Amino acid sequence: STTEELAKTFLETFNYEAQELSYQSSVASWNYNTNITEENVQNMNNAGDKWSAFLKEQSTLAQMYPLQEIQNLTVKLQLQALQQNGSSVLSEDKSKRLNTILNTMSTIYSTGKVCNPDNPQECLLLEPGLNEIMANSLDYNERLWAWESWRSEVGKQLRPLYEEYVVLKNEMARANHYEDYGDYWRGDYEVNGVDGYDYSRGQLIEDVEHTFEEIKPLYEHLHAYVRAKLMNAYPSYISPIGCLPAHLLGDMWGRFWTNLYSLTVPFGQKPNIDVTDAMVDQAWDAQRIFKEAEKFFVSVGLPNMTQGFWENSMLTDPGNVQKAVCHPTAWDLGKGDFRILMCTKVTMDDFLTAHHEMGHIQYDMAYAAQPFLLRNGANEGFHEAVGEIMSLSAATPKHLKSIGLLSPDFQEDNETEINFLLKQALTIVGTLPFTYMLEKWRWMVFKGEIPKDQWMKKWWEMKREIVGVVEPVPHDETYCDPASLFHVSNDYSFIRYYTRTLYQFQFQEALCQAAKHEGPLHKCDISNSTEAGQKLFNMLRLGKSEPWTLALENVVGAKNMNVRPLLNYFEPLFTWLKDQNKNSFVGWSTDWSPYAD
Amino acid sequence: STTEELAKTFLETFNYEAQELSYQSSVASWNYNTNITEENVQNMNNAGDKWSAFLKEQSTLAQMYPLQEIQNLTVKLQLQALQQNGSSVLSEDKSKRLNTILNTMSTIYSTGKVCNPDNPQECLLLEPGLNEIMANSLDYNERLWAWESWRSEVGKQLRPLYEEYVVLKNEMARANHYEDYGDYWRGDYEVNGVDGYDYSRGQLIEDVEHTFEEIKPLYEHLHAYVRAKLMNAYPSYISPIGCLPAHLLGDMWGRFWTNLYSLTVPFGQKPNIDVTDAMVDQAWDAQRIFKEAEKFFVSVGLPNMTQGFWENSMLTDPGNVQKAVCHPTAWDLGKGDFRILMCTKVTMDDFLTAHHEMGHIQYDMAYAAQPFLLRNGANEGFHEAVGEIMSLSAATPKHLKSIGLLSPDFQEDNETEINFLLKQALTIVGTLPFTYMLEKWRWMVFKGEIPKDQWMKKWWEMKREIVGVVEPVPHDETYCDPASLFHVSNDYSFIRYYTRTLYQFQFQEALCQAAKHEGPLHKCDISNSTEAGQKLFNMLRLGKSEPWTLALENVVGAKNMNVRPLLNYFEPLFTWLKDQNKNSFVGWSTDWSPYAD
Amino acid sequence: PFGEVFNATKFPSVYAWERKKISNCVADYSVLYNSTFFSTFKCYGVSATKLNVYADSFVVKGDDVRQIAPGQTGVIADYNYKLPDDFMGCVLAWNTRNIDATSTGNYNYKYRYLRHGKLRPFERDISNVPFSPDGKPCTPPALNCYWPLKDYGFYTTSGIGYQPYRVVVLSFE
Amino acid sequence: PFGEVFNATKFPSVYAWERKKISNCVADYSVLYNSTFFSTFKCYGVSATKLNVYADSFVVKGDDVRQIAPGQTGVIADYNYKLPDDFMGCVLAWNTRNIDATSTGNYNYKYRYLRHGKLRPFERDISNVPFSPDGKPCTPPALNCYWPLKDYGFYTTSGIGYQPYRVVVLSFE
């Protein structure tokens, strides 16, 4: 028949074939990840290889269809997703070289290790060696050591590779009709044909940067506070008007200032929102953690966990004997088979984490109706965003009281609202500038705008200008610090984390609005809500099926990314901060350094 | 010295003297209205005669000042406010007859009593006897009785006097260079010399009728809906297409449909916005009610009541023994002496009233800065409007919770909201037509477009046509139903209620805008809003010193009044009505009647 | 002789469902009235006895059972087994994960996904000819040619709407 | 001999204010330090002691007390009692509703509302001549002729700024 009609039939045949290969592959991936056997790591490949090799075969066949000559959004969507020419647009030499790079970088990072200069006997791997230093050490020089070792070894190493990586990856992008690789990535946010719901690879940067402006005041203060705080922690090493020594930031990069809480706590007298002990004091097992989580979702209107979930999930470490990987993940294998892998400890951070993960699972369930190629979050940001909303409503003292882990006598006083909001901003708000800047550099580095002989001289041109952070020791183009951060030297889009962060704060607002919630936004608990779930399930049932703009509209009532709600969450902290900073300096001079000359 | 200079000293002499007589007059008037003794009724007159006699003395004396030959707006106003003629423009024989009428009428009304046809022992006085019947009886015939006896006895009586009242009062007006007494009253709204701020006595009618047209759609529905509802209440007595029987409107005239609530409530299963019972169940006294409203004003930035207020006001009927008039009034006796006179019942209707009354008192206070002759609302409508703005914020479910009359848990949803809106309409939207219609008939019976032999024939035409109300029994020209209402037979301008209701929402818009408020106007509560409080005061303190058009432009930004705001406050109820009425005839026939059947 | 249909060791694929003829028999249906071993049992006729019959057997995916009913959308009901509009008796199903699925993958069960026009109530198609959306012979590898028959893939760890269900459809005339 | 001033059974009207000379005395002033019985106590000088004076007595309206200080606007400070610009001691005032006010109305207290020119600091004027804004003799009935001295009218029910306040002004030299 037509070209449209011919296409339906192709996509159809594809689905049913993909479903079988895809499932076989997950089942493989999983078994390996729950049971690290050699025979398993063998099949984890086989199945993943057929899958990937079938994907190619299909993509290149899917190429024989003009989607421009197709007027049925749904079909266009899947067809075009499948029209993933990918690295197959390069010559066989490029494509193999590239994979070697992508791999080599991946390897170096995971395998990298630095050794004690005056005790070369013992070396540390980033995890958990260096990491635990960057997270716990109050020693300026020990912290400096790790920080500088890591970037000077496994950093300088990824430099050469990264340069070539950029070239090879750019050609790939150019050949597929993108301005650059940056343009490629920004692609994820694009929308064509719907009106008002249309969105462009350009209009990302535009929105991203505009949204970020209205974040400076909140951050500048957050900054201002922690600085004074850090001045006491490392007296003499910091300047009241200067940037923050990058190695004094809580982790190997300062991606999150989370670990600064210990020494930036507003009122160290106040006690606990940490039911870590309230759980242990109640003989809570991995079963209760999740059964509870289920109940949560059930309350707002969503379904039980499929019996499959209970029969198939791994919730507690099998210990030794049968060892496994421990990263918490939500598995959507296919053939309506969901499950979670999590080495469940009895931390509140895990009871919370249970929720974030099962958020995912519920999302995975909700869109199982959609055709195979549309089952996934509206964008990279949506899926994590839904994860967090859950984490959020459960962490409220109110919900904890509702459960009965928190003594139904706790007085939620004005000051406890602050230690909470600060421990929050330290993670949620801390990471925003950091995250923006990083993709600001990449984005520019992929448009030649940042010449090779200015890569590092430019990292920190923005590490100071944007983030308010400095290098404790100076770096020339021999270094490649950005590549010492996972996502960078592992080829992952990173802006995802900004839009995610932003998104979630609209979701929560719009849901606490519908959940009819009175007090401050951060005190909100969508449990026992229903009309809230409904408003949520409306965008959960689509995944990639409609433009995110619509999906997002379904829950908030607006077509775009809004920072306002994020700010509302932190408005009570912001006011306090401003007053705190009464006599401290707000802002930073770029020119100051912890090394001088 | 000049001519203007001579005037300055004259007015100063006036102030100091007037304040001394005006006060003794008010203190007399008070001691009477709170204690109807015979020695009291005496002095009430004396001081009130010395006052009015001194005013005359002064008026003719002011007459010797060319205000055309004066260029200081402030002075011109007061001088010319004093260049008044009143009823002194008539002859002695007329000016006594007139006062005798005005007194006879006033008396008849307050002393009227109907007695049970089949029981000439018991009799009831309008308040609280007839009134209670009209506000509570579900009995068609009992309500028919009251309604008809009142108009039959105390009505047929006022008839002659009113006819003569019309004459002598017309003369009074004409002799003062007015078209009729109607023109006289429409005088209040006039302004000359300012450009764009000028307003003519005719331009009222024009604006009023115009503005009113835009209310018809909304009122017709209200009508349509309460009709249906009333059909269930009074099965068989109403026509799906016919007007509403006057005796079934919740009070003695239908001035307000407020008491219809109990049997027209949209969602009875919801938790009642009539906190009347909540108040009763919580043992609230008159003290709590007033101390409660004071706190409200305090919260927006206004002052406590003068300790004098609390020692002098009469807040609960002394009962029998020492008898007093009950109409709720807000007294500005002078010499900074304020008080309220109200026989406070523990109703909600009365708690709202407390605020409207206390509203006046705040306005009285706010312009005690002004020279004696300028202490008064911008126009007649302003003072009532200020009262109502208060009455508005206080009656929202939001405020209700804040107070404690509504469960801290109360979940404000679209059904409660319609309940609250439907109620607010029964009062606010209900009077609009009633009041417009009343004043038209009156205005017409002044320009004498209505001859003595149709006086009623025409009134009921306008009830049927404008208000969609019909009389249950026929009324020949012996009847004088308009005078059955205090305001008429007690000689009071009435359009104020209409104009007042418009300003109400105009102010409310801009006050909530000033209070940085969320969404739907009807949901706004200006409590705790110094910003909003402050704004109102700035127009409050201007007394009559400003042309109402300007002062109204200071607050809302409008040379004139506008019906738009009102219409928005009611949009939800408008669109929800529109639906409900889908199975009803909307509108009426001037042809149906319960008697001509 | 009914327990020689539901209880038979193997079952057909929907594309080639088996009709068993049963005449001159007398059975109680009571063997069926009392059954929690039964996921579906919608009887588009009644639920009484006269001790007098057609028994069609086959296997479908969970979320495919929904189609073994009159007026149902398609794919399974469109191209494999199309119940009649009014005309009817009973549709019976039951999960068989342990029997017809394996943790490793069981793909013995087939079903037809492409065709030229829907089947008539009770029609059958055993054809197995490479398919082109516009008639014409077909010779894969060739493009726009597909084999009409596809494999189910009943893994035991899958979701309920992805587990094997044996279905028996009884008919009365 | 202070308790002989504030405690004097009666007090004068402002236009006719009373000056009492106090010399060759010793007083602790602490009779004045130790007082909440005192609504106004501004001392445009100090608040210590040298055990050493002129007391000025008179009555005014609440809202008129704000004029018993230097640099003040008018009417009372203009035509009755003008305090000297810098030159100053203390100004003391206290509410007297129960004493100089009556529910029936109390008008004994006078004040000059008209005049030809401001008083100098500590000036006085007991005059009572019909006033006209352009000099010229006066004889009311006649128009534009007013009597300078008007009555206060102190009612017990009135607002605070309309209640009587006895005021004593101490001066040093």
Ligand SMILES: CC(=O)N[C@@H]1[C@@H](O)[C@H](O)[C@@H](CO)O[C@@H]1O
């Ligand atoms: C919007 C539209 O064109 N309708 C259909 C859609 O309902 C269906 O799911 C799809 C499957 O091929 O085909 C078309 O897209």
Ligand SMILES: CC(=O)N[C@@H]1[C@@H](O)[C@H](O)[C@@H](CO)O[C@@H]1O
């Ligand atoms: C300078 C001038 O002419 N202004 C005066 C003002 O002082 C006074 O308060 C008012 C009453 O006479 O009139 C004018 O507004």
Ligand SMILES: CC(=O)N[C@@H]1[C@@H](O)[C@H](O)[C@@H](CO)O[C@@H]1O
């Ligand atoms: C100063 C003011 O206007 N507020 C006070 C308030 O502080 C006080 O506690 C209350 C008790 O009488 O009365 C007043 O409302």
Ligand SMILES: CC(=O)N[C@@H]1[C@@H](O)[C@H](O)[C@@H](CO)O[C@@H]1O
């Ligand atoms: C309108 C309203 O809710 N009033 C609140 C009251 O609830 C609260 O106790 C007080 C303390 O912050 O502030 C406000 O006056």
Ligand SMILES: CC(=O)N[C@@H]1[C@@H](O)[C@H](O)[C@@H](CO)O[C@@H]1O
């Ligand atoms: C009407 C009059 O007397 N004028 C007043 C004057 O008393 C006052 O001092 C000034 C500001 O303080 O405003 C006016 O000009």
Ligand SMILES: CC(=O)N[C@@H]1[C@@H](O)[C@H](O)[C@@H](CO)O[C@H]1O
């Ligand atoms: C056979 C076919 O492709 N048509 C279906 C149609 O029955 C359904 O109502 C709608 C949404 O699912 O569109 C198609 O999926």
Ligand SMILES: [Cl-]
């Ligand atoms: Cl870095």
Ligand SMILES: [Cl-]
């Ligand atoms: Cl009437």
Ligand SMILES: [Zn+2]
């Ligand atoms: Zn996750």
Ligand SMILES: [Zn+2]
């Ligand atoms: Zn009023």
